[PDB]
Design a protein around this ligand. Sequence first.
Ligand SMILES: NC(=O)c1ccc[n+]([C@@H]2O[C@H](COP(=O)([O-])OP(=O)(O)OC[C@H]3O[C@@H](n4cnc5c(N)ncnc54)[C@H](OP(=O)(O)O)[C@@H]3O)[C@@H](O)[C@H]2O)c1
Ligand SMILES: NC(=O)c1ccc[n+]([C@@H]2O[C@H](COP(=O)([O-])OP(=O)(O)OC[C@H]3O[C@@H](n4cnc5c(N)ncnc54)[C@H](OP(=O)(O)O)[C@@H]3O)[C@@H](O)[C@H]2O)c1
Ligand SMILES: NC(=O)c1ccc[n+]([C@@H]2O[C@H](COP(=O)([O-])OP(=O)(O)OC[C@H]3O[C@@H](n4cnc5c(N)ncnc54)[C@H](OP(=O)(O)O)[C@@H]3O)[C@@H](O)[C@H]2O)c1
Ligand SMILES: NC(=O)c1ccc[n+]([C@@H]2O[C@H](COP(=O)([O-])OP(=O)(O)OC[C@H]3O[C@@H](n4cnc5c(N)ncnc54)[C@H](OP(=O)(O)O)[C@@H]3O)[C@@H](O)[C@H]2O)c1
Ligand SMILES: N#Cc1c(-c2ccccc2)[nH]c2nc(N)[nH]c(=O)c12
Ligand SMILES: N#Cc1c(-c2ccccc2)[nH]c2nc(N)[nH]c(=O)c12
Ligand SMILES: N#Cc1c(-c2ccccc2)[nH]c2nc(N)[nH]c(=O)c12
Ligand SMILES: N#Cc1c(-c2ccccc2)[nH]c2nc(N)[nH]c(=O)c12
Lengths: 248, 249, 248, 248
Amino acid sequence: EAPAAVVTGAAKRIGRAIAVKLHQTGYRVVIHYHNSAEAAVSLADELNKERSNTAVVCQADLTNSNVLPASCEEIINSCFRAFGRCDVLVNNASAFYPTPLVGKTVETQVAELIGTNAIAPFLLTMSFAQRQNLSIVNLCDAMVDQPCMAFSLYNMGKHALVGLTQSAALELAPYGIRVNGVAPGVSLLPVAMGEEEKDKWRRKVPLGRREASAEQIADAVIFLVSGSAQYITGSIIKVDGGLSLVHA
Amino acid sequence: EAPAAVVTGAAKRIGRAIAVKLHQTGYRVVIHYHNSAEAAVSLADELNKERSNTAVVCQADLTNSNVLPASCEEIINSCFRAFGRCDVLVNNASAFYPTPLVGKTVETQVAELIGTNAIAPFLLTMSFAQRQSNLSIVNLCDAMVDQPCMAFSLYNMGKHALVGLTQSAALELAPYGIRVNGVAPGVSLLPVAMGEEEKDKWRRKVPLGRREASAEQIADAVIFLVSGSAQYITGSIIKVDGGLSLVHA
Amino acid sequence: EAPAAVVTGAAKRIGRAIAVKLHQTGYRVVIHYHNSAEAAVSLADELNKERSNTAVVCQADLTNSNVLPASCEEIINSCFRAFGRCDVLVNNASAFYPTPLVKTVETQVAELIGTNAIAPFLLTMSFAQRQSNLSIVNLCDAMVDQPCMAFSLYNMGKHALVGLTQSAALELAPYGIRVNGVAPGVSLLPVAMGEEEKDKWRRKVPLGRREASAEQIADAVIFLVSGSAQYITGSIIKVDGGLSLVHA
Amino acid sequence: EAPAAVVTGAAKRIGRAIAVKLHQTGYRVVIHYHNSAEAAVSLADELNKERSNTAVVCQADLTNSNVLPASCEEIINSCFRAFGRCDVLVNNASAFYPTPLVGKTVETQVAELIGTNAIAPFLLTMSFAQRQNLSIVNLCDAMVDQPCMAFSLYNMGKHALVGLTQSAALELAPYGIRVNGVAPGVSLLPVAMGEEEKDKWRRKVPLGRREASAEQIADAVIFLVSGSAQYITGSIIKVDGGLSLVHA
Ligand SMILES: NC(=O)c1ccc[n+]([C@@H]2O[C@H](COP(=O)([O-])OP(=O)(O)OC[C@H]3O[C@@H](n4cnc5c(N)ncnc54)[C@H](OP(=O)(O)O)[C@@H]3O)[C@@H](O)[C@H]2O)c1
Ligand SMILES: NC(=O)c1ccc[n+]([C@@H]2O[C@H](COP(=O)([O-])OP(=O)(O)OC[C@H]3O[C@@H](n4cnc5c(N)ncnc54)[C@H](OP(=O)(O)O)[C@@H]3O)[C@@H](O)[C@H]2O)c1
Ligand SMILES: NC(=O)c1ccc[n+]([C@@H]2O[C@H](COP(=O)([O-])OP(=O)(O)OC[C@H]3O[C@@H](n4cnc5c(N)ncnc54)[C@H](OP(=O)(O)O)[C@@H]3O)[C@@H](O)[C@H]2O)c1
Ligand SMILES: NC(=O)c1ccc[n+]([C@@H]2O[C@H](COP(=O)([O-])OP(=O)(O)OC[C@H]3O[C@@H](n4cnc5c(N)ncnc54)[C@H](OP(=O)(O)O)[C@@H]3O)[C@@H](O)[C@H]2O)c1
Ligand SMILES: N#Cc1c(-c2ccccc2)[nH]c2nc(N)[nH]c(=O)c12
Ligand SMILES: N#Cc1c(-c2ccccc2)[nH]c2nc(N)[nH]c(=O)c12
Ligand SMILES: N#Cc1c(-c2ccccc2)[nH]c2nc(N)[nH]c(=O)c12
Ligand SMILES: N#Cc1c(-c2ccccc2)[nH]c2nc(N)[nH]c(=O)c12
């Protein structure tokens, strides 16, 4: 029987690449999405065409709220209902936008940024553990200690996610569930970012003066879920081409 | 005119010590509290007896909710109402209890632990800056954030988020001349719930003296960070832990 | 043509497993050693029996001295002499013993700082100057911020090795040379260490209550030298079973 | 009776400001220097004019060598000769120049850079501890994880110094000796640096767009040796105006 993985925010960009690469490795996949329904269903079609009965979708808002615990239970449930098991959880989904200290209300910003980046990962981890080569991989940020100007809530969420990776590694080790992170620097640049700013970020990266492909990020996720990482838990692997080493 | 400080969770223990030492240095203080009304009022009485009209109390629940931004704005408002200015914010209030992964609901646990330790400090920082000398903010962190207590995931997540706020806020508020720093205890005043046997277990782990930090020793680090001797220090988190975080399992 | 690797301290234990795993992956290997001549020759014999003309030995003392730079240049030379190329350097050799603050101290400094830091630096210099998929892997220590009592000089050396890893990753990026680290917690325990003390350490590891095999450490080295880690540089991967996360 | 402090590299710049503030606080001081004899003697003259026989000078090369242990012993010896006691050690003296990976020989660069920044502090720590509000303060570097291009040996030394700070804090705690660090970002910029290049660094600092005065660095040292830091050991306080927080 093939193992099964849940990947949050898997319809596009890095989540999509992780889902595809896990599928190619032999996993059956739950494609979670929020708004990108067409992309999600298109991915499931592609993967099922490759191997029958190996991909499904699950929609959920991962903003923090009174119903989030139930929403996270249902995402994990969807893996069990379709595939009868859940071996891997990849916390990839993420809100990312500025929240200056000095449109959306501040309480909504808190809910979205801390919800997607930290609280949802915690609730999904809870549900994943309770329902049991098991492992969880959290998508972190290599630049968390040199944060983007005016992104305090996003940065707080990513710091919180490091805490979860370590706390969960410690607590779930007795159950044989490993918990690790992968920390991109710059990978697929945000859709809205202008071409001039995109070029400025590329020119800062020591290794090749370009961004990581989504596949290069997925390669690190594949390593951490594999048998070659069976003693690795609580580790966060930077995949940033030396960007975080570069001073102001 | 004397400067003014807000200290959250100041009715007892480390918060009280910070409030007292700030007062003794020359600050007027807002003593924020949640449930400890009698203690807060008693402290304000003691400080006002030393110097008239230099201490007030301010009640607020810092659990996460849609009104938390309003509550945080109001704590800063209260400092301006009493003293006409607000120079120092100390984020000390904290919920602390285990939340195992495997009669509070998980929603409540998230709201209290992430609210008190991270979101409230963020909203108080927003309101503090929005209203703006020697201005600074001090966040009470945790020296053991990378070697966390078993089954304290949400608390640990909160304190990690607080490190992020400290760095992010230091970067962003530097242009306004507001410094943002942290003080990170190891073991200080042990919980009142904890039994004496278990307290001794923790004391025995500390390289420097085999004892916990007094509240005053923690307050000493806060006073340094707010002082003129720390004018170029921002984004720094000073451990005050007697070497505890250096000890392997 | 097969690529070539230098592994320092490769006669025994973790170094041996790295050399063997690199060889199985297809590398030709220089097996460096200091005192373990018989074990080093035996390894080279076994690898050459598998694939003729794919292994040689190279003896060198890596204690700090005024001739250490020449010794390190000669190790890199030996790879080129044998195989006409040098693609991978693994800095594994290490002196490990206590040096209480309260053998001469000159010797202790020369051995502990030389093997763990200065020799890696000089080998990195020689490797770079002689220059695809080029990279360097440094054997670090996951417990570097929770040090063993009375091991100041060892700890200083391993801290220095982190600094080298980061500094060299930055400077050598424009030459396409990646520089990374693998940081064991407890793996193969010291030969001198008593059985009660070994059991004490094993019981502290969250993930399985046992030390890592030398093979589990080699697995992370292999990941870092591979095409799956092409955007990874300046990264140190802990392989410690969660040991570094455990408070006193 | 008044306490006594040894400050290495105390003739000029940051070391001088530290010696002055320690003296103003009530300490008697050993002013250590290497080449700057005129400045050292003139500083002692100034302090002795304030309070009779409260300052002495002590010359020593802190480059790594066979005689360095003896030399460090004699620096501590000189404090006891002059003042009958040694309460505080400040490791401030430092070599700082580039050492690219691709007329000094490399062995000499190793000796100077690793000697001044790491090995000498270690030997002075040994001698200080052996001879016993006692504390040691090590001058570190806030930018140690975002290092200057082509400064590998300097960076390795400063990393090693973090290792010493932590290892010695642990080991010397039972004797009541605290061991901490102060980590400037940019303070007094090097004399050899051109004013255009100095201006570029100043413009990078979030808090005030300028470098730290030597006195601001001295302020953190005074805090760490005071009674207001009695429970603080193994801590490194950045004094960098937010510089280490700024991405590339
Ligand atoms: N891209 C980079 O250079 C970079 C750098 C550092 C870290 N990372 C991290 O790597 C991961 C992947 O990065 P990325 O750039 O691919 O991410 P992304 O495109 O910005 O977002 C990934 C997905 O998150 C989902 N999402 C957003 N808000 C949500 C919500 N409220 N509820 C549920 N799902 C929500 C979205 O799903 P729908 O489209 O279906 O709405 C989105 O497609 C993220 O965790 C990110 O923080 C990326
Ligand atoms: N004590 C230690 O050994 C230690 C170790 C590491 C870090 N720290 C940190 O240092 C700081 C002080 O420690 P402590 O032990 O003195 O703290 P504490 O007694 O556990 O808590 C301090 C105050 O936080 C307030 N608080 C709790 N929940 C609240 C809520 N929902 N809304 C508003 N206020 C709330 C309480 O106010 P009321 O009493 O008025 O209800 C309480 O008196 C904390 O941030 C803590 O995390 C302490
Ligand atoms: N083992 C662990 O649990 C552990 C934990 C943390 C980090 N590490 C790191 O992982 C690496 C491998 O560990 P290990 O336990 O396998 O190492 P090890 O057995 O202690 O040492 C490996 C080799 O280093 C060589 N060596 C010692 N002094 C030398 C010198 N002066 N000049 C040249 N070579 C010298 C020796 O070669 P010869 O026998 O030929 O003389 C020895 O076989 C080391 O870097 C170590 O620090 C290991
Ligand atoms: N300045 C900054 O922006 C900055 C930034 C980060 C860290 N730091 C650290 O803070 C400390 C003070 O900085 P600084 O700029 O004031 O230092 P510095 O001027 O570069 O050096 C201080 C002294 O070190 C002594 N020294 C150099 N080589 C020596 C040797 N081989 N043996 C004995 N002494 C030697 C010299 O003494 P003589 O003059 O008598 O020969 C020199 O005056 C240093 O540890 C430095 O690394 C400074
Ligand atoms: N670029 C970028 C992103 C970064 C980022 C990029 C550079 C430095 C720090 C963060 N984080 C992101 N998170 C999400 N969810 N989506 C993104 O596009 C990014
Ligand atoms: N002891 C303890 C505490 C700790 C703590 C103590 C030891 C290691 C890690 C954390 N954190 C606390 N936070 C609050 N709010 N109150 C406490 O009492 C503590
Ligand atoms: N155990 C162990 C070792 C450790 C070590 C193990 C646990 C904590 C800190 C260090 N480091 C070593 N280095 C070498 N060269 N050889 C060893 O065996 C070890
Ligand atoms: N500028 C600067 C220095 C720095 C430095 C400044 C900024 C970033 C990294 C290092 N370190 C120094 N060490 C010594 N001994 N002397 C110096 O002048 C500096």
